[PDB]
Design a protein around this ligand. Structure first.
Ligand SMILES: [Fe+3]
Ligand SMILES: [Fe+3]
Ligand SMILES: [Fe+3]
Ligand SMILES: [Fe+3]
Ligand SMILES: [Fe+3]
Ligand SMILES: [Fe+3]
Ligand SMILES: [Fe+3]
Ligand SMILES: [Fe+3]
Ligand SMILES: [Fe+3]
Ligand SMILES: [Fe+3]
Ligand SMILES: [Fe+3]
Ligand SMILES: [Fe+3]
Ligand SMILES: [Fe+3]
Ligand SMILES: [Fe+3]
Ligand SMILES: [Fe+3]
Ligand SMILES: [Fe+3]
Ligand SMILES: [Fe+3]
Ligand SMILES: [Fe+3]
Ligand SMILES: [Fe+3]
Ligand SMILES: [Fe+3]
Ligand SMILES: [Fe+3]
Ligand SMILES: [Fe+3]
Lengths: 159, 159, 159, 159, 159
């Protein structure tokens, strides 16, 4: 029961952490002249914040007290050296978003908290979509970067 | 006094110079069947000329006497071999436009010429955007040009 | 600091004084059957008052105490004998508007008051446009008045 | 070859030269408060530059190497004293543009270069119309400047 | 002048011949799955035929007797192995179209046939545009085809 309140607060932190990691990915893309991939990461940064705001709102309604935690500095950017590394980190970030949502559902299920589980259902489906989409972009980015300059042409044309 | 009037006049010449350099870039791109990159240089050539006209207009209003210098012949075209060479020269050109605007601003600041400093503000911000845009284009052109033929795709598809 | 607060209040008084001088010019023109010139002077009166109101509003937001001074009777009217005299006083009123703005900016610069400096930039630019516009009307007025009756045609046709 | 290609280049220089002379006329007119005449010179300035770009564009298509030359400092502004002097230099400039075009056409005829002659036709007709329009303006300006101040109403009303 | 009436007739044959060669080119393109290049050759085939009709129409009005000649079997299809060989034959086709226009204009000039020469003028300018466009396409095709598969995206994306 305390576990439920803890996992809920951690979901908020995880959304906001994802939102900062996305922003760090747009900066890296922008600094390295991948403006289409940057615009994509920027849109994801705003979206992750909207998720965390959606959790905060539900918690206020349900009397789950939210104690906002520190949002840590993203640190992967120190090591990114190609768009491929950035997308790989983004895939790992969404895999962790999926794990924390399942931990939260598990706790809500243990507690028979039907309302929290109903709240979570659209996030579960949305995670399935997002992991698939990022997995597919990573596969494209990886295949295209096998020919010098070719990837640059995707950024420009798509995104 | 003298240094500020001089530099204001020189700014006009620098704008027309850059207009002619963009025209010469447009010619090399056309003669070499890069119509996309040519259309872009041609638009920049008109734009630099409009910058110079804006400086002449302000000088007329502020009674800064303008004397039109000769506009020098562009020199870099005899040595351009690939689009990379052209965008590099264009980057350098814009870096000189920037330094030029800084020197004029510095002379305005010493004279406490608040009107001239205010007039220059939007040009300083525009230079930031311009140097970024050209740096970004140069990085693409340099990356795509590592595969024979791939840069033609950039011109055709996206200019 | 004292200087900047005093100068900022003096700037308000200056704009209202200019508003009354323009009103005085409009009266003289009307009484002397120059209704085109009068209507121009009258739009100028309302505009100077709007400048003084913009300074008042900024001062309220920025906690600069405003103490509204008397607005002195315009005094040039008792000696105006031709439209040339009126336009000449108006040009001098605008040159005096410009210097007070520069002095205020100078005090703002010395105090590192970046907000006040930013607030002043569009007035510096507007004064440039105004002095040029009044200098140019005064040139036309002086030149057309060399033939008896001809200036009367300017008022009717183009104001 | 040789002669034709030379003259074709020189035509582009002539257009840009005229463009700078129009611009210097605009400055003179502005500084001396003839805004109506200055707007017209400024329009011609943009128009002469478009002619030169029409020539560059055709040369690119026809494989006529363009080497862009210095655009000479306009010098007639140092001696202009009144609008008649400016319009008189402008007449002379257009008479030189015309002779310049007739020379080029003469070389094309000699070379049997039918394409170049077809390209030149609308320019010959445009020059006939421009010399006529300028002569007419100069006639009006010379006539009106017989009475002090009267020319000042041409600028204000027309233009 | 038998020479003018013969060359005029030959020009009609030449346009219809070009029409067939273009059709032959679209066939090779289509058979080798270059559908966008194919559509462009087809469009040219129709417009060569229209040029031909335009000559026949003028001739009937000017009383130049037209005797329609055999339109020969296109033969370059036997040699073509890649898109480059096709575009190269198309360039030489247009160079020979230009050349026969120039012979025609020459015979017209000799006869002082002012109406014929006036009739040919837009075709001279059109030929300049065509040779340039084809030059440019062939440069792009040759460049892109330096990487296996790359030319296939030009057909898909740009035709
Ligand atoms: Fe998302
Ligand atoms: Fe999304
Ligand atoms: Fe999320
Ligand atoms: Fe997400
Ligand atoms: Fe997404
Ligand atoms: Fe620009
Ligand atoms: Fe510029
Ligand atoms: Fe620029
Ligand atoms: Fe730009
Ligand atoms: Fe005003
Ligand atoms: Fe105003
Ligand atoms: Fe004011
Ligand atoms: Fe004012
Ligand atoms: Fe005004
Ligand atoms: Fe015109
Ligand atoms: Fe011209
Ligand atoms: Fe002209
Ligand atoms: Fe004109
Ligand atoms: Fe065609
Ligand atoms: Fe044809
Ligand atoms: Fe054709
Ligand atoms: Fe075509």
């Amino acid at each position: 029961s305390e576990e439920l309140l803890d996992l809920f607060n951690r979901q908020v932190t995880q959304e906001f952490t994802a939102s900062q990691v996305y922003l760090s990915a747009s900066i890296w893309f922008d600094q390295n002249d991948w403006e289409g991939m940057a615009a994509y990461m920027l849109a994801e940064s705003a979206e992750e914040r909207e998720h965390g705001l959606g959790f905060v709102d539900f918690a206020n309604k349900r009397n789950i007290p939210i104690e906002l935690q520190a949002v840590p500095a993203p640190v992967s950017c120190a090591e990114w050296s190609s768009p491929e590394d950035v997308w790989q980190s983004i895939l790992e970030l969404e895999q962790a978003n999926t794990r924390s949502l399942l931990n939260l559902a598990e706790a809500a299920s243990t507690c028979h908290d039907f309302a929290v589980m109903a709240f979570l259902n659209p996030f579960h489906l949305q995670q399935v979509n997002e992991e698939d989409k990022i997995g597919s972009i990573l596969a494209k980015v990886t295949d295209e970067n096998r020919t010098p300059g070719l990837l640059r042409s995707l950024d420009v044309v798509s995104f």
